[PDB]
Design a protein around this nucleic acid. Structure first.
Length: 123
DNA sequence: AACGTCACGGTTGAC
DNA sequence: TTGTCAACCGTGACG
């Protein structure tokens, strides 16, 4: 649902500014226009202008960050939780040792056991 | 008067 | 299939 900000600029709460506006903020910055002017001219909150400008400097892109989705779980299951729970053995507790404890405890099978390398990555 | 930073109420999508 | 949840969003306000 489209809404209006204090400066009279249209925006959708939760969603990124449309590309046409993002593109314009950057064009203006390249023209030597001060950020505060871009704010009043385009009617975008200055906090937003600042963000988009700082991001263009870091990433070199107009496009917004990646929204939504689940981080890839290569080392999937509650197993990950069990590996963190092994915070009592922690120091000295080798990567391969963890794999063995995961098997005799019941949480993991011999066929479905994570490689010690993967556990190193997770730990 | 300019602008860096962040809580807030919000939406999204990979698994 | 439907739902969970951590990633991001822009505004508005503070310093």
């Amino acid at each position: 649902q489209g809404r209006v900000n204090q400066l009279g600029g249209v925006f959708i709460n939760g969603r990124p500014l449309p590309n046409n506006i993002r593109l314009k903020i950057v064009e203006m910055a390249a023209d030597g226009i001060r950020p505060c002017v871009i704010s009043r001219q385009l009617r975008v909150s200055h906090g937003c202008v600042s963000k988009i400008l700082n991001r263009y400097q870091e990433t070199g892109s107009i496009r917004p960050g990646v929204i939504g989705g689940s981080k890839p779980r290569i080392a999937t299951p509650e197993i990950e939780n069990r590996i963190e729970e092994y915070k009592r053995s922690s120091p000295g507790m080798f990567s391969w040792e963890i794999r063995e404890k995961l098997i005799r405890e019941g949480v993991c099978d011999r066929s479905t056991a994570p490689s010690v390398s993967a556990i190193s990555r997770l730990v």
